[model samples]
Target chain A: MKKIAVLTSGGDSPGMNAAVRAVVRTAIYNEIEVYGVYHGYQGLLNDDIHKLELGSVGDTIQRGGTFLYSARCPEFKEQEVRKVAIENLRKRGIEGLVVIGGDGSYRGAQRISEECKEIQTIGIPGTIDNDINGTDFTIGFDTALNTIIGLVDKIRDTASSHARTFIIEAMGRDCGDLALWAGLSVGAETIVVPEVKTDIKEIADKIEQGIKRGKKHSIVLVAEGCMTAQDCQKELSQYINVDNRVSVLGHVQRGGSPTGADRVLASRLGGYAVDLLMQGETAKGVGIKNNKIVATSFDEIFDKFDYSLYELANKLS
Target chain B: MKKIAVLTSGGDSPGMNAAVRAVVRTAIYNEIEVYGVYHGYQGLLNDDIHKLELGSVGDTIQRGGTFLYSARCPEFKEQEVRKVAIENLRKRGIEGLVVIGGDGSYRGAQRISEECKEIQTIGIPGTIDNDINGTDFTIGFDTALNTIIGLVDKIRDTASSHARTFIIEAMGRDCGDLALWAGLSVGAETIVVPEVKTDIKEIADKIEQGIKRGKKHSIVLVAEGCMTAQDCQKELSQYINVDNRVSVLGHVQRGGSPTGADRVLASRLGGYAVDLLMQGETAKGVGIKNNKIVATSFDEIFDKFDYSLYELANKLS
Candidate 1:
């Protein structure tokens, strides 16, 4: 892989910046030329490619969201459109492409690899969604989880005194990991996810139990995949009389400075992605034991809930 | 001032925890009893008050929002209802009350001061609004400003590549300071603030000029007080053919960890609020000459636009 390019696709995630930084610096260190595609696959199609120097990613590790940006490119679904995108890279003598984004982004990278035998493609899991299967915890997951935690913590303070039920809708799109993780972290009274069977009657009973147990405040963490917070609030009210406040965390979860884990993971995965190209065969699986970080890709964990964790959380609450 | 009470009223802001921490630490150093009121004025009415030690505020200075929380208390507006709230503090032998929040919160403190000659009250401006008078900068203003700046920066990264017009609505309630400051920081092409006369026709031409100049991206920062981002998008599009996207930053601004300015301001105001009770004769207005920080209380600057700064930003853009 003499020449390679980097692009951030679909939605921008916090540590995706660091991922690009690692890719650029690692390639430069290995004496491989690196170019940047401006706006994901669309940028490649538009011929918006530029060679990235070492300074191109300066001071971006601490930043949230990718500097490259991302936009939805529906045309990339067409095989013909992908040919034009691949040509943009091939014309620049770029042999490998490192894509940093969600699962949808990975499909595009995979398609390019299958279509063009000469161009190698690799992907770094980088979204708040944590929806990608190749990685257990994606780059932006920690940052966004902490963001939701902080918001829920603030709301709980209000709840503790106000004796209210707060329905917080966390962003997950299709994954339930964010909602499940945050619910456990905050000790929310009720947790609803698309992966789990949610019973409104049972949830109402849980609220009643809290009330009877002398707990005034209750938190219900809902994955947007299950329903809107407004819908949750409305549905819950039908079963129980409660003071309800609904807050949608919205795109706010998409940003904020990346956490230590996010930055480290992005750097490691990005460097590994570069290695994947040069070495021709690479890793997606990393395991930890002695307090050091490693990569572990691929999981059937997407639709499956951690019943052990959920039961523990349920028992604790 | 042997026993002073602290309460965070109205909406919770990022640095209110520091303000309360300062109050607790300052009061404890003076051997005064400090009690924490749970949920603003409503807590006072409900007797949700507890004594706070130095350790009570431990690790909270770095946190966002008030640990004490806040809720709207429409009942507090009743003169008779305020008497009950005062009696709760009076019965507990809490003399001076340090109220931290915006103008509505300040009004409550003023009422308590006027109604009960036994209790002394000092107001610490602590809101995202920066809407309060008698304080040049509120505790949460800088924190929220930085939060908005970070988001806008990410959005601009997209705008630059996508060739689109983005209307970002910032939270200020009625004050345009947040929008103005953020627009300038991000080099927004057009800023529609509540303090200025907005002519959509002129704004359309400014965006048109950018198009004529072959500039692909444009940013319009709209203060929520002026209009919703959607409204601004509609009005601006009435004249110019443009690709527009609207993002309302919502309540996320109220939650991140306080910036250096926010923490420092909260600490100073919190300590000064304590001092104000004991000293009897106090200061609300302070100015800076050297590099050291100083308090500059009270401002006519809220409603008045910084024409000089605004013009400078306009010219630079």
Candidate 2:
């Protein structure tokens, strides 16, 4: 393939822009033409694509959210709709594609490659949730975790001030990776995630014991998948008399300049994805496992959501 | 004043450590001795004070919270308790006191000066709330605003992904400065604060119009004083058919390393507070107004809580 296209689909992540930047630059470095698909697969369906030059991705390494834009394209799930996207790629003379997103985007790319054998595709894990298979760390996960830890640090200040119990809700719908990492990083009192059954009475007991021990503040980290922070606050209120505040740390986690870790991660994965495609590898996702960049087939990626981190957080907290 | 004492009282803010560092270094530079009173007035009452040298504050300008620590001392509100504090300062040969905190700390400092004519006191506004009267900006306010903006940006990612509305409740129980500044900075769709009566219908209309205009997500910034984020989310849900999430940005707003802006502000004010005491000025609060360090009598310093910024946020948003 002389030229390839790249698009970010599903939810936008902090380092997605960095990945796009790397993809564009690396493809150009290899004397390959690159096209940017706007609004992910939706842009492909609408033929809203443009040629990406080296300057296209300049000054975007630190940006949060995707500069390439993204959207959940339900229509892209259909082979018929994907055929149109494939034809559009063919018409543009783009024979290879690099997709950046979570598991959903990987599945979409896999279907597209299956339908159009003429077009090769590579995937890069790029969600803040870090839920994608086969990667030790997703592109935006580090940045998001830092953002959460920063916020929790601030909350801890007021918690001690008012002697209150704070229930902080973190993202990660199916996986508790974000919550676990942040909980441990911030030294939360209790962390409740979907991966483990949370004992509400035990949490209440801990808060009471802390107060009895002259501790003025308590923090409980709850993953969105386990339950809403409001629910946890309400449940705790029944068992304890301490003042409770619930913070659902929403989208802000997904925005802001990506951290140094995220920018480097995106750059590495983006360049590696393009290199893999150039080496005749397709339908694979690029990831860093155990500090080493590795490419694995889509079938082998995203198989496990580590719960050890959650256990570690519990033990440490 | 031959020797001055510094203490952080009430709620702890991010730049208090920076302020403490500045106080210690500036006093030493002026050929004066410095004492750090631990746990604010409670420490003074208990004689929990230590002489601070230049090295005591080394490498501490970027730290969050206060090395001197802080506490709400109800006992300090009593004349008998303040007499013990005064006796402790006299015993230590500390002729002046520099207090870093919000309005409550200011009041306590004023009482100390009033009760003990032999010892002078200066106040440095260092809380994240920015509610104190004389200063245009508190030491930790900028850092706290940036923290809120960072988290909101991340939340925006998931919000746009699911086409949801997020209500982020920020700190400031009596003042809406944090909410106003952060809302404007982050370009939130709606900002609700205690300083102004919120028109729930207008907020609902804004959300509806944005959705009609194809905006995938909405962020509503709320000050904790106005109402709970859950209340705002529930009220907005009544007028619009959309998924809503509430995030009460609890104590996290008060913790984290001070931003560059905050560090400079703290350093300037901390040095200025000590300078005022040395110049025989007592019962004054040190503040930065119009980008210049100014000292005002405690009576006039915390008399006004500006709400004009809220209007500006409204206009800009």
Candidate 3:
């Protein structure tokens, strides 16, 4: 518990740097030494690590992506690879691990646990996808959602002026969580999430009918994995040709300074990860459940966690 | 000028509402009766004028676009038709007229002036084009620039993420004033205005070279009148499959609450216009030139005035 290592895995999220900063500064505050893996699992396996001091992450809370950096490594899929990773950790006097990422990286953490079975590890979800299960919200989700809301606000300009229909596609592969939340927040007329039983023709008819009734603009939010915005834009354009515009939000949502919410969330979760490690806790991922920072073992909270829980909570909330 | 009629001509600028508020409050403050024209010159020709009070324009400073609305009228181009409009104005016993728009609308103002040579007419420039003559800066230009700057700040987000090139087309048709000022403020690499020739291919090459030299992103400001944003986006995509983003800041630029600068400018110009009318000024435009409220004749200062001489002045200053 005198020394620990943290790595950001999978997709780079907005507040990952905040988490890294908190882990570095707060651990230093408690007189603990922290080592940061340069590229998540890949860095852990390759022994690519750096001594994280307070100054290493002095002003990174405003950044969109992880400053620790991240990369996916197939080598870590094997137990021997993770064992080698652990040996690298121990040789450097690293006693515990605090992993940050989605389920794939969490599974890698579980593999690291089996390889050593002695060194403790804690997980912090850091995916922009907001798809990580067992959490009400991830570190970067709020920032990314606010980014989407911002773009939706601007795209509203052309739609209102031309009396057009606009379809904006956003990130969230396999999960409609981001799209649903952003659409509801912005009051998008039609939201096309993969989780919902969408009526495509009915949506088109409504847009047309709305136009006839002097409603100038109709907004449709589409989750990226569900369909390309280009396809939907064309479909809507067939109904209202001259006045239709589509905004494929693309990586813009993935890029922007994390909102105030994200920086705070990452700091809290990161500090808790260090706390749990100092107490010698094992196999748990930190998550916001029931408006509380809670931890559960990766074994019970892997793929079984549904990201739609956030969308449902968002709806009811 | 006891009961003068005022209408916003052409596209509504951001400060048009502020100008309206000033016209109402100041005219009433001067113990003059102010009448509102529904839709610029066309509204006057149709005698579509109504009495306006302080309560009629409550809390309008925060709103975008013209509450009185605006339209282009080809019918008013005929001299006989214009005389009939003058007769209509005479029937209402309107003492004077204040026209707000670009030069074309100002020329209409000159014509209206000829019909009633004894009547007072004042023009206030209110387009994002910033192309009008005799004015240092138009009412809505500053507000529009700030709005576009705010969005471009977000565009900087994904631009850095994917290490991409982007082009933001601002609201300067046939004028690079907005683009040049915004480019300098945001540090855009290239700016294309109708006043200057822009080779899109060369622009892309510049951004490509920048990216190759470890630059994350380059922003190019293009005036919409010269080339469409789609053209600029396609031109840049040729160099590399960089993430391309385009924002066509349309009427939104012309429509929004005026910034503090515009409000102060509006109040000063509004008061000075009345002063000029009382001083027996005719067929003149009241505007801010060289940091002072001044009046100029239509012949000496017309629309499409060359503002390049004073291009050194900027909102940044």
Candidate 4:
């Protein structure tokens, strides 16, 4: 492939810009012409494509959110809409495309690669949810986890000072990785997630146990996929309670300057995507698994819960 | 000098543990006996001192609060209290002491050095305020700044989404370093700090100007020494109109695991404290200025504001 392009799809993430930088620089280093597609699949359909130079991505490695921007692009599910998006790419003679986003975005890339055999498409996981298949950690998961730990750590001060229970909702749709990791890091007393069956009474008993032990304060971290903070707090009140505060961590988890781990992950995956294209690979997702960067077919990519980690968090708590 | 002792005084801060680790390890490496004074100077009076071996400070370098613990101990100012504390150390045959805390804590160390002829003392600035004199940057300041940036970035997401204004108060007490550094980092448009005179009316107009320029939201970061967030918000309301939120950011700023930068600073200052004591240096505080580590007498150590950096923040804003 002589030319390649990259676009960030679905929601924006902290390390998306770093991934974009890698795609641009790696393609250029390999003597391939690189372009940026703005606004994800939406921009591809709207013909918002432009050539990218080295300077275009300067000072963006540490930034949060996608510099190319992103959108839901629900219309991308339509065959006709995708056809226009592909035609827009074909018209410019772009031979390869890298899509950085979640599993929903991967579906769009798979469709493009299958329908347009001449052009190769690669998917790179870039969501904070860590819900995408085939990767141990998505690009923004580490950064989001760090952000949550900071917030939870902060709330802990007030909790300890006033002997209160703070129920904080962590963002992770159907995935408890964030909650598990953050809860363990922040030493939250209780964690409720979708991966494991949550017993409201058990959580209530745990809080009561802490109080019995003279543990002044407690943290109950609930993943959004399981329930909301208010519901958790209300449910916990049925058994035991204390001056409780509910903080729905909302949108904040999705935003921040990427941490060092995230930037490295984004860069490695971004460059890996470009390399896959050079090998004529398509309909595959780029990810770091077991500390090794590997590519998996879109169909082969999957979701599996880390039961061991969840159990470890419970034991530590 | 065959033996030395270390203690953390005043409020606990992130990296205090790292400093403790460095002091213990450095003292042990130098073939000197190291003892940990628990709960600051109050611990000294109570004789809550214990031998700290290599493993005593293990797995504590990354911790937030001091594993040795801390306390205010205002009674430490009394001569009788100092006599008891010195007698406790003399009984242990401790030849030197290292105090990790704020300038107020530094005073206690200086007194120990001047009054106790046998046991010399060194002070390491270890507060989130970044208010200590003689240091370009304090141990916990970077960690605190990072914490503020994370919270502010989260608030920024909500602010931009709702097109609202957020007046957040940063912890600094008499210093504006945290407010100035965090405001610049999160790209807050208006920063009210003590280093520079704050004009309430000017702040209102500046926020209004942002709205006129089609900017969705604005962040106004105020240092605690300047005024409360509520005061800043009420004063700003007199000039402009907007949906606003006031977050005091209380206690949270002083919490969290230290960042890599903070840990390095803490380690350097901690080891330096041990070396200072070994060299028979007394009444001195350890600090890093312009990337160089230096020691200064407690009397010579004084407060100075970074107006150039404050001005830079305004220019960037």
Candidate 5:
């Protein structure tokens, strides 16, 4: 393999740009060609890939989302569509590829590799959801967590001032990692996530008890996948008589200049992925396990992550 | 005045602590005794006051909210309650009072000064709303703007990812300054505030046009005072077709470490309020006007401020 390409697929996450920068610089250092694909798989299908130089990624380490951009390309899910993408890569002399995104992106990369034996693929978990099983922390998870904590801190002031109950909806569709981490960080009164079955009445009772104890405010963190903030507020409204407001954090959790932790994590994983590719390894995913960067086979990337942190959050909160 | 006192009233803001610290340190530097009145006027009425030294406020400049605390003292609205507070201050030999908050806090300070001829009162605008007429910028306003911008940036990622619309409700009751500033900062598609009456049809048309132009997302920044995010979302839903989500920034805007700009503003206003009190200038509010500290009498503090900045935001956006 003389040349390789990188593309960010699916939803954009903070630190994806950092990962792109690392991929280009690390590959250039190894004296291999690096190409950037615009608009994820859609770009590959449109033959919108370009060579990346050292200066191309200059000053992009602090940016949010991917500089290369991303899109939801359903056509990429088709074998016929993927064949065109592989032919485009072959014509460009790109023998290896790096795909940065969540599970959906990895699945696409997996298909490309299996379909075309001549080209290899590497995956880097890049998302704020922290849903990837192999990595303890995903690239943008820390930044998004900090962003949530910041918003929660601000909302608490208005809550305490009016003695109101505030329901905040955070990201994480299938996983509750964001809601759990942020809820614990801010000492929210109650948290509702997809993974946990929570009693709405129990949460209502806690708020009622807190009000009786002269607590100024109560905050409830809800994952979007579990329930919308409005729905949570409506459910709790039936049991507790209190002034309540709902705020869905929405996409803001997926954006922002990646935090220092995310930047470093992204750089490490991206550089490590390139090193493995140079050693002739493929179908691998790079991740941080126990604060150290490690490579796991694509087959092992789907391991079930422990829910101990969520339990710890419950125990402490 | 040989001695002075400071208190934070109404809702807490991020830089209130910095203002409190400055009031204590500034009085100390001027060789005057300074007292910390707990829970605003409620504290003064109940004799919940204590002397504060320079070291007492150490490491508090960066903190959010107020160390002195605040509350809605309906009792303070009465003449009898004002008399009791004055008597408490007299007994403690606190000849002057510095109230840190919005117009409501200043009104309390004004009454205390007019009722008790022996004691003077000064006001420092310490609020995230930046609605005070006299001050071009309030202590916590900058910090709150930054917090909102940070969230908007993050939300933008998810917005662009799904090609969805996000409605973020920010704090600002009766004032649209926050919504205007944050909306402009993030280039929101639409902004709704108390000061601006926007037609829902116009917003819907804009969104429709944007979608037709292949724009991925649209953001609407709404001031809490204008309308609930849900109401705005519902009104828009009636006119345009788009996936929309609402997020209320909530009290988190009022909590969190004050930004450097806010800390400096709080410190300058706090220290200047002390200077005015030492000069026997009573019933005055200190503010930043034209990037310089300016003292205005309570009579002039309520003057109608020019909404030129709001117009600028509209023009630019």
Candidate 6:
């Protein structure tokens, strides 16, 4: 039987623990010994790793955040850190790795594979930002989108009561996927995103039109990357009336249980990532395209396609 | 056809809309005209009321918060406000009212009965506090408890990763009912609330004992009225060398799409409340006990029982 290692890097996201569950259970079924590297590449560099049994990940599919934990490590960029990670994997007889993260972490997985040349590494896009390329959706995006919609629904209640216009900000970092989807789901009158230019006048004009049309409430969804809700509110306050409220969703969006949709997606992605690594695949990121798991070289994923996907988000939005 | 009035008062809770769905659907099914009283009693005073048809409440069972909206109007305590509200109902040819709220609002419902001696009114308990006397469970309490538990599962992920304790403060106001149920559901090591006078030592000692027993992580569910998670965190920091995390669930605990349990409960309770009115049964609140719809007179429900459920929770926990 072969041995494989899995680690989650960068910021944590919901459904990450589900991925861990799938990795343990799927690998155990294949008679493969799975090792979980704690605290991402920092743990890998420091040898903070342990053998994972099926019970280690039992009942974890519904959880948010990563059980393996994750953090950015500047030290991982050093050649010495790469050497230590490779040596650590060799000492444990681990043949390959499945790295779950966004761009920077995927780049690290690619670099490790290129440096070691002997071990394979497969990447699974697991960021809520939805910044990954070559995929229709990421693992936690659906859960986060629903969570944002839930909050927007609440704000709408207050908006109706006070006859106020609310500028609700949701997380996206550099992507507008979450904001656009939630705004559409909840019937927000206007959406301001980084992918689109910030035109508060056009938005205010829409709000005026809604009021004239006898709309009791109006909502404007602002992506966090585009502009803070506070900034949007201040800019709009100059043109619009005083009955405007701004709500920034901040870290609260990152802290909820993974929904059923996220759990199933995580399971599929984790299993697919493990299968590729075991097949001696290297410098590849496993992603869902056309509802099927497909792998791409890491160079194509992180370097060549990141900008193109950003364009795709614009076209789609 | 008989005409019945309905309104919601006090802070909104999950499944309040579920109760509204039930009341509207069942009353219409029974060939009754449902009058919607907006903005709680204030709407009654201002005559902001409308006839609710089937279309008024279509597709709202899964919604959180109150569909009728709610408010705390001290002006309604005055005799003039009460008389006007009563007069408005008689003018509209409404014979009964279905009230949804907590203790203060229930008092208002009872007052309306005294003013209009012939009009029948029934209450449906819906406080997030869950401190109401008669019912073993309120319409939205169960949904709120499950929402808290779901978020607790998310905190558990990080707790297990660092092998640390987590004290999650939930919204229960003065009642330990939400805390007790949430703790039991999630299998927390300790639960502290106003109903039980537990100091920091008891919770920390229990967590310490759990760790010594080879438990990697411990959860202590806290009720808002008892103490904040920050206070617990500060006290625990004094005793343990290891660090722990505090998650104040804030208002998020009282939210989510009403779960199936709450939706069904609301339907039964709402139907029963309407039936009591149809039969000229007044001065009562409808509730579910052991999955059955049951009713008790308003005065008897208010004065007869104490919250012995928390004691049961203590024994079970």
Candidate number with greatest lDDT: 4
TM-score of each: 0.51, 0.53, 0.50, 0.56, 0.53, 0.52
Q: Candidate 3 on B53-132: residue-level lDDT in tens?
A: 86676546446788888988888889988987788777777777788788888889899888786567888887877777
Superposed model 3: Cα runs more than 4 Å off: A234-242, A303-317, B1-317
Each prediction's DockQ against the real complex: 0.02, 0.02, 0.01, 0.03, 0.02, 0.02
Q: Write the per-residue lDDT of candidate 5 for residues A42-85, one digit (tens) a residue.
A: 99999999999876885576689898999889988899999999
Tens digits of per-residue lDDT, candidate 5, B1-317, equal 78999999988998898788778877887789999999988898889999997668854755788999998888888998788889999998888999999999999988998999888898999888888867778888877887787788788878867877899999988788788767755657688887766789998887788778766677899999899898999998898778889999898788778764566567667777887888889998898775457888889886632364455334323
lDDT of 6: 0.76
Off by over 4 Å in 5: A303-308, B1-317
**iRMS per model in Å:** 14.8, 15.8, 18.4, 11.6, 15.8, 14.7
What are the runs in model 2 whose C-alpha is more than 4 Å off?
A302-308, B1-317
**Residue-wise C-alpha lDDT for candidate 1, range A1-317, written one tens digit per residue:** 99999999988888888788878878888899999998888898999899998768755766888888788899999999999998888898888888888777877887888888889887788888887765557888877887887788788788767877899999999888888777755657688999878898899988888788666768899999999999988888889888889999898898988764566567767777887789774223322212233444333212335665565446435
Candidate 4 lDDT (Cα, 0 to 1):
0.83
Q: Give the TM-score comparing model 2 with the true structure, all chains together.
A: 0.53
* The 10-residue segment with the lowest total lDDT in model 6 chain B: B304-313
* Local error of candidate 4 at residue B260 (angstroms): 12
Cα shift from native, residue B31, model 6 (Å): 36
Candidate 6: clashing residue pairs, number: 0
lDDT of candidate 3 over A243-310, digit per residue (tens): 66668887777777665446656876887888898888988999877556788888778642334433
Candidate 2 C-alpha lDDT tens digits along B1-317: 88999999989988798788778877887788999999988898989999997768754655898989897788887898888889999987888999999888999999989998889999999888888878778888877876887788778778868878889999986888788767755557688888787899888888788778767677899998899999988887788877778888788888888764566567668777887888899999888675456888998875644464454334333
| Superposition error at A228 for model 3 (Å) | 1.1
Error of 2 at B85 (Å): 39
lDDT of 6 at A220: 81
- Point out the higher-scoring one by DockQ: 1 or 4: 4
Give model 1's TM-score for chain A to 2 decimal places.
Answer: 0.93
Candidate 6 lDDT over A182-213, as tens digits, reads: 66445466777787667888777767776787
Candidate 6, position A46, lDDT: 87
Comparison by TM-score, 2 against 4, better one: 4
Residue-level lDDT tens digits of model 1 in B117-155: 888887788888877765556788878887887788788
